[PDB]
Amino acid sequence: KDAVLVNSELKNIYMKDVINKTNMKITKKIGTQLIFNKVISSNVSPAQERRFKEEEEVDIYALIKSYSVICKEQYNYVDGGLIKTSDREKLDSTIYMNIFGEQIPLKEQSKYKITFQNKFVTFQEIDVRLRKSLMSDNRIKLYEHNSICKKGYWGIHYKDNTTKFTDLFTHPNYTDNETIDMSKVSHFDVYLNEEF
Ligand SMILES: [Zn+2]
């Protein structure tokens, strides 16, 4: 299973900004990195690299891992976050986030919703936005030294009753560009202080 990390590291990882752009043509392509023109480098799996060709337009939603200036031009490094611009069908979805946990009032239980406008969204996007929403929540303060959440996980609860669970104290491997079909998603479930 993915190794559990501490608040300090998790906070550092998920507090960073994200790249959220559309119609980005892959300019250069080197190794396992798909480059775009500030320069955006997306580290992806050997498998995913094959599926993407240069000059191909890609929509990007990825958390930035680091920056580096090179010859007065800034580089933004990220893992995956790619969906072909031609793979984008529109769809308005307002998915509810149900938060469960001993200190969670019914009032905060289902007040959170995450809005999507494409039928297909990367899992990285859902995971990152869900974590950031939990991080800013005044009651929860996810990854803060002082947070009431010591451990936990969440899940995408599909309409067919199946679920996809993720440990909130781990850093998923986003290099595979896993994508979620939003039309098959019913809601999101957050399980605070519950063993994964
Ligand atoms: Zn559920």
Helix, strand or coil, per DSSP, at residue 34:
strand
| Token pair recorded at residue 55 | 């000059």
Helix, strand or coil, per DSSP, at residue 147:
coil
Which of 193, 97, 186, 188 has its CA nearest to residue 136? 97
Q: How far apart are CA 73 and CA 19, in angstroms?
A: 16
Question: Measured in angstroms, how far is the CA atom of residue 154 from the centroid of ligand 1?
Answer: 10
Is 145 annotated for ligand binding? no
Question: Measured in angstroms, how far is the CA atom of residue 58 from the centroid of ligand 1?
Answer: 32
Q: Using an 8 Å Cβ cutoff, are 153 and 166 in contact? A: yes
Is 187 annotated for ligand binding? yes
Q: Using an 8 Å Cβ cutoff, are 45 and 33 in contact? A: no
Query: Rounded to the nearest 10 degrees, what angle do helices 7-14 and 123-136 cross at?
Result: 120
Which of 110, 128, 57, 63 has its CA nearest to residue 87? 57
Q: Is the torsion defined by CA of 136, 140, 145, 150 positive or negative?
A: negative
Region for residue 190 given its phi and psi (left: phi exceeds 0; alpha: psi -120 to 50; beta: otherwise): beta
Alpha helices in the chain (DSSP H): 7-14, 46-51, 106-109, 123-136
17-88 sits in which CATH class? mainly beta
Non-local (6+) Cβ contacts of 7 within 8 A are 143, 144, 145, 147
**What was the resolution (in A) of this experimentally determined structure?**
2.0
Amino acid at 185: V
Q: Using an 8 Å Cβ cutoff, are 98 and 189 in contact? A: yes
Question: Measured in angstroms, how far is the CA atom of residue 37 from the centroid of ligand 1?
Answer: 41
Non-local (6+) Cβ contacts of 180 within 8 A are 120, 121, 122, 123, 126, 156, 164
Is 176 annotated for ligand binding? no
| Token pair recorded at residue 50 | 């094959």
Where exactly are the structural domains of the chain?
1-16+89-196, 17-88
CATH number for 1-16+89-196 (one of 3.10.20.120, 3.40.50.2300, 2.60.40.1250, 3.30.420.40): it is 3.10.20.120
Question: Measured in angstroms, how far is the CA atom of residue 99 from the centroid of ligand 1?
Answer: 10
